[model samples]
Target: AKMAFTLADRVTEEMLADKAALVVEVVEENYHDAPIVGIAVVNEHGRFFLRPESALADPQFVAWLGDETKKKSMFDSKRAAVALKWKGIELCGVSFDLLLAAYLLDPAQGVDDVAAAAKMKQYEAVRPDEAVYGKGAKRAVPDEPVLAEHLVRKAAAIWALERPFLDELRRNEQDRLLVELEQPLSSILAEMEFAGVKVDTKRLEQMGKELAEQLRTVEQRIYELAGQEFNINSPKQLGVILFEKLQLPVLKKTKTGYSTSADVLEKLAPYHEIVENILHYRQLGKLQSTYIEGLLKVVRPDTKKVHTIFNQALTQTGRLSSTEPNLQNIPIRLEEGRKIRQAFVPSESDWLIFAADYSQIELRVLAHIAEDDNLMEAFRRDLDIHTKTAMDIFQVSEDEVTPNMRRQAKAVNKGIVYGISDYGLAQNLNISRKEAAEFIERYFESFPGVKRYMENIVQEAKQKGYVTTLLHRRRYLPDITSRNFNVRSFAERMAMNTPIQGSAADIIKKAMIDLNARLKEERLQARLLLQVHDELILEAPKEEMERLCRLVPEVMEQAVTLRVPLKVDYHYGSTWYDAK
Candidate 1:
């Protein structure tokens, strides 16, 4: 039998009075702050539709939808909440989220699985959105009756899946994670998304001009070195110039022609200076196109701000990622690329961008989890981790550790965190595989407990067929039992690294929740703007700058108490560039 639903003409207060919670899906033209064309609701009472080409026109119904007192449920609740927030509705009482519940159960499936997960759970086999609306340029909104049927089926699926999904989470002991962490974090993220970041259009335009000039100059320099002009963007053309004309040693050959890839160019850099200029040209081109033009395209003309969608449940490690002009991927290593941050000024005048990031958070996590006395002692003493590692790896005193020794030590320290192989470490440090293996040996000897922890974690993964963070955020590793050496070796490394990286991710998430509460309790104008891995960025009035600088690190440090204390470094400036 077909799932029965109704196309209601209007929503009334009496209609919603007795419902425990309504499963909703806001119909919008686009993912961002597009116009809300319709609203679909499914509850025990019945399924109904509310179509208002501009839903904001009906203030009373909109208020009812946003009322925190009323309970609600949805598939991807954050997106619906975010869309409502943009239209002047801040929703609460989102008691159940089928999307999040399914994510907690099977994170590997990623965030977009309401229909998929519902079907797997033996619920209704709802039609895919693509099947209903078509796709790409051919896509168009279905007729009202067709749209009404599609929306209600989707809503009904969520309603049916809610109870069973919550039970599944409890079965896996992940109910608290969804109820306490993911649910609460969704609302916080919605607010941040609605309050989009301001962009300085003029600054971006100026940078675009400078980049164009620089690209031209670099193009001329490459021509002078090669004694000919060619399309630098054309790999085949440039390949012939470098390999045939200039006679630079060819490192690789493609089926099409010579491989003029960045890797080959990087190795050939020592042989000729033209390769350096080519690399510089590529860098400038990316900055101009991706950072400048790409960012400008997304900035809302009215607000001059860019709203990025943070995919909370995408990563296996539980780390958040953003898309549609990703804020997190901004390049920091190059000065020209980093200057793009100058465009990200405080939204309000007389305000400053405040930033605070954890220092050696992952290493500290390793120390705490691994229970390495030497590692703990170094953090307790407030010593530089890389320098201390250099002393241990090179068998030298701390004062005797040279820059080169410290540089190699830094690479080795990074390698240890990710379960780096000797071959991988050799490539990173540009050393022989034997030397990299020795460095790893020395590191293990210097901190025997860390080595013990690695062995124990791998064994634990093998025995249990999964690994977990401190918060019980689980990642299943079926490959731990694989017969293939290379496959098993990779799985073992994942088993070793996941716990460390995943725990670090959980800690930051906890810190964000804590910081959000503290900001409200303090009653300050300082609001969280962005979270890039270990760092949190906020915008605050000049009056609240000093207090926020103190409050942020204090709350972040106390989010969770570990064997070793967490350390935070804070800075404030007129813009993000200056703040760093």
Candidate 2:
């Protein structure tokens, strides 16, 4: 069992009532036990009290608190089907889930509870938790009867919000996107979380030690350069040393002191050796704290695996966010940071970690959604889309297109697809804004259809105040109507990019559902482990690798029909690092 199903104590008058399922937030526990489910739940310590049952039929189990742990409910096979985020629910079984529906209905709000979602819809009968439980440190759970009533209401609340989504999604022409893609995908994610990815703690600790040594070396160098011992982690001390003591030019300042943001340090790198080391220090610091140390903390000792919960209902663009040590944000760019992947090993000695990623998926999605002939032709002909763009922008043949031209071509299209300004492109491409501006103008001129698609989509959103992916997943851009230039500009950009990125998301998610189906039908040894945007990671026996390479790309490319063919590439390795 992955979650607690029933409370040990007598079913309260309220728990049995019709309203019980609506108000109990999936994120919340202890409506069952006032302290364990409610008071303890508002933070991590309380969360530990609500862990899953230890067995398939167990009525009780030890929880992994700092130590004191205990019971849950009787297992029933007819577990209720609900909840988009089932990371906590699938174990002990049964309950109402509304967040996923609420998300599809209104992604921008990303409400986690039914009562809160009800209020947004003007469903006035439901009481928000803040109203019932109070707020902050002053918060206290009510009497059993009072708490039980609210818990019932919470359960009822999910249904109230969920019932109309069919008509609503249909009205938006997103029923397929909602019911078929997103809803079913939730179950797959839940299974993935339950399976959990193995983490090599020994390898992780070894990397942490290496990073610690590097940090010490960098700290020593910074101190030597500063000619004093000051906390490098302390921004005030570092700022004063850089700006006031050594007297390097302060590029920017915050309300408290100097703005030692990454860009500022990066720009200042040429001016000082210490600046580059500081940048390295910062990157290593993030890797150590957020990855090495952070991941190790979440790795369950019993399973020797780190379980990440994927949020299906959070992002407006329909992208998923990984929590419980976010595996998605792990650095793959820098060598020191990239080494974090080495900790993710195959589940068994004979197994291999196979990763398959869509190459230029977003751009291919853009070509299809926009129906731009030039863009589609590049993908259809299997051309290097960026280099092709570079050749056109530079007005050079394939042979004459330099690597730098191709690089800028890639950068400009990436920026342009997102409707970003020259200022944004300048930062991303490390070109002057004027260069970015000129690059964009040349790009649009060369790919005239792309320019028209951008113009037409913004115009489309202006008329409708919303955007839709190819599969009809909708994201309303209410700010498209805003009088504020910044607000309207941001919305306009979102209007253009949402379809491209969102449709790409829609594709991979559908592919996952299909892949999971095949895994069951064939009884394959391959287990899907992680989804990092366009990439899917799997663990399979050496025997399964041959089939996986062919089967995976087939699933991905055929996930949706488009004017341009989707491209998927695969790599298999003993460790995740080798696959990359």
Candidate 3:
């Protein structure tokens, strides 16, 4: 008989003596030592059968089954095959791989253990009440026999459903790259997380205190501007101050009273001095509370460093989001907000924080994918892509294009990529919707190939019910054929944007994986700490900073070759805020 082995320790012959239905277990020795959380069985000869002891007991078991069902739905085929010769047998530990597979399969779903539990409750097959508790039970109650029986059946079903697909995944190397290459590459990230970036807690704390004082001053100014002492954060007080006391024309209203949103207040700022003060007050208040105070909260007591988690599979458009202290959303446009970065100094003496970002990546991606030769040529030459765009759409030479024309062109380009309607564009540019629509139409007419590409992509997505990136990362558009205009419009926009955004995302992710590998190969101490949209942040020792400044750009620019060249902008400072 062949021996069974866990990913860590080899299963002894004595361990399988009494296990009648047991087969040979194959384990990945390199993976973390975890138990056989799941089992799959295949009876090629119709001579084998499952034991009656395998069943679900409580709500949790039923929930787990339901979660597995949702995962099954996302696969191209809901079947797996295990090669078991009548006397020969094979068993594989797929618990960890299964979870990872579900993540890569439908990244937009953001699957986790808790999310899986919630999704399972929605499926009829694995309904908690029906499977674990009696049909009419108010809630699933603990019943070991019932739970075990259900789990056994679920294991059987999962095997029957997923075996073929797993087999196919094993065969298709390209499609399984995320599982094979990316999954193992994630270990490097785990190492970085464990290492934890170094921080100057004392400096951060001092900065926080200073920012708090500034915030108090801003609050006092806001109260003085209103002619009464009141809670500056209170929307009700601000509403009354703006509408009733100040008699400012209300652009919009909220449940509290009046809309004090930044956009609404910005419009009123041109008309009222008090409104301008309030807007400035709100801006500073946000900088203090969200950035300064927020940064203070995330500092590690032991390491004195902040470790931001980069989410690789969060956004449908493929952009990354950060959490556990989101470094991405840090305010960089304002000098006051820029002070926050001063606290993010290097751990080692003489070291600086180095930052690099793709310059107009999305627009460059759009040019290459849409086969816009003019746009691609502009990117190739490293000419101001946006300025060239303004010239093309406005019918002027590159030198003749005015700043205002470039600004409008930039807005139009972004709006088109985002699937924003004329109304939305008009609202953004403070122009008539008719003018916005005409601008868009004229822009499309000038860039006829790009216009055709957008229309064709949408039409294909409508026909096929999905859109795919250049590398075939799919985003389904079920609502493309919906009767509702809002739903259909949303799907159409997704169809237009998903490929461009998803491919760009794919490029960055590939860059990260390659850069990580290169860092390891070179024995560099530098580590990737966070990814926000098109940017990547790394932490390194003082000695490695200059090398990284060059290495990072090279890796990203060459991450994936396209018709247009990818550009990266770099920055270095003592702290994260300094880098900004």
Q: Which has the better TM-score: candidate 2, or candidate 3?
A: 2
**Model 2 misplaced regions, further than 4 Å:** 1-97, 130-143
Model 3 misses residue 129 by how many Å?
Answer: 15
Task: Please give me the total number of clashing residue pairs in predicted model 1.
Answer: 0
lDDT of 1 by residue, 1-580 (tens): 4667767776655446434334334444346766555567776678777676434466776676666777777778888787766666766778887777777777776547456767668775588776877778877778877877777777777777778888878888888999989889888888788787889999999988988899889999999998888898898888889999889997889998898878788999999899999999998888988999999998999999888888887888878998876999888887868989999988999999999999999999999999999999999998999999999878899789999999999999899998888989998887799999999999999999999998999999989888989888888888888999888888888888888888888888899999998889878988888888888988989999889878999988998898999999999999899997
lDDT of 1 at 330: 83
Ranking by TM-score: 1, 2, 3
User: In candidate 3, what are the lDDT values of residues 455-490, reduced to their tens digit?
Assistant: 999899988777877655667678899999888888
Candidate 2 whole-model C-alpha lDDT, 0 to 1: 0.71
Note the clash tally of each candidate. Answer: 0, 21, 28
The order by descending lDDT is 1, 2, 3
State each model's C-alpha RMSD to the native: 2.0, 7.3, 9.4
For candidate 3, report its TM-score.
0.76
Worst 10 residues of 1 by lDDT: 17-26
| Most lDDT-accurate candidate | 1
Residue 378 C-alpha lDDT in model 2: 89
Score every model by TM-score. Answer: 0.95, 0.85, 0.76
